[PDB]
């Protein structure tokens, strides 16, 4: 029993069980399958789901909150979506939310704070200008509906399933997609991502109480700019970064922790230097490990040469 290889899937966790859904490979993986990885025993189980099963998608944005799985956005065979689903862990339910939803998009991030799911950025269609924030077209998408990056922040209030947008202060990060978000306390961190012609190395956080954006400028050596990397809270003071894809299209296998209190990056030694990954997933276990799954070992933009993986990589940190 083992899930097929894939990139752009989602993985979420309760610290013990890792739930894996979707993604594509060299196209989309079966929509009705939900793969569960037991972090303690190392075994996989597959279960088939029912209800309002979402279309097979890559680049969806998922979270696990009290064993309830929430899923937003993604890219299916007919384009991007802004649908919102939940799965209480065998039956998917599509939730018809109130308020103005975000624009249809994929490759974004989410912070969880109390009752709120807070989504940021991503890549998709031109919004209705009702949305506030900025959207910038990817000029090359006109040559293959045009799409672009956004820096939007949206709240889905799980108390009422109503969409809204906070008024924020400070300088938001530029629009971006394939960035990584991580939450610690009331701070929603975001690192790197793709915007225009760069895969970036900037680090910000949004205060989830005051809605104030802050840019972090760590002292000393910082990880190379990248997208399609993972960033994972592993303590109340450390974010674990792995892998990704550079501006110059290099697949990455370096691992770092960002120490929040010291505002310092620390490069992490590990046995997987020859196993670079991008568009993988990463989940923190209760025993201090980061469980990496899936993703692609080389440049996935060369589709016929793409090396998608179904390997589990375990980082003990």
């Amino acid at each position: 029993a083992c899930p097929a290889e894939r990139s752009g899937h989602v993985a979420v966790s309760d610290g013990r069980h890792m739930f894996v859904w979707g993604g594509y490979k060299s196209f989309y993986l079966p929509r009705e399958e939900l793969w569960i990885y037991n972090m303690e025993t190392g075994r996989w189980k597959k279960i088939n789901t029912e209800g309002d099963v979402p279309p097979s998608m890559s680049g969806s944005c998922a979270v696990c909150v009290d064993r309830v799985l929430y899923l937003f956005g993604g890219h299916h065979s007919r384009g991007n979506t802004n649908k919102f689903y939940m799965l209480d862990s065998l039956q998917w339910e599509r939730i018809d939310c109130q308020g103005i939803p975000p624009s249809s998009k994929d490759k974004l991030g989410v912070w969880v704070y109390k009752n709120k799911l807070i989504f940021f950025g991503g890549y998709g269609y031109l919004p209705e200008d009702k949305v506030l924030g900025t959207f910038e077209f990817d000029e090359t998408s006109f040559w293959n509906h045009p799409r672009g990056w956004n820096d939007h922040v949206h709240i889905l209030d799980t108390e009422t399933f109503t969409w809204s947008q906070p008024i924020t202060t400070g300088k938001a990060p530029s629009p971006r997609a394939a960035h990584a978000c991580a939450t610690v306390g009331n701070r929603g961190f975001v690192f790197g991502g793709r915007y225009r012609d760069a895969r970036m190395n900037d680090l910000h956080y949004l205060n989830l109480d005051t809605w104030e954006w802050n840019e972090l400028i760590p002292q000393g050596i910082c990880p190379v700019g990248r997208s399609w990397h993972s960033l994972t809270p592993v303590s109340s003071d450390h974010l674990f970064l792995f892998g990704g894809f550079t501006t110059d299209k290099q697949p990455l296998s370096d691992a770092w922790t960002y120490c929040i209190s010291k505002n310092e990056w620390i490069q992490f030694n590990h046995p997987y230097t020859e196993k670079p990954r991008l568009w993988h997933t990463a989940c923190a276990s209760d025993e201090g490990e980061v469980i990496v799954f899936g993703g692609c070992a080389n440049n996935l933009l060369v589709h016929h040469r793409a090396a998608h993986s179904n390997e589990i990589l375990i980082f003990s940190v």
Binding site: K107, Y123, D138
Partner: peptide, 7 residues
């Protein structure tokens, strides 16, 4: 291919 555009 369209799913990986924009990253």
């Amino acid at each position: 291919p369209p799913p990986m555009a924009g990253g």
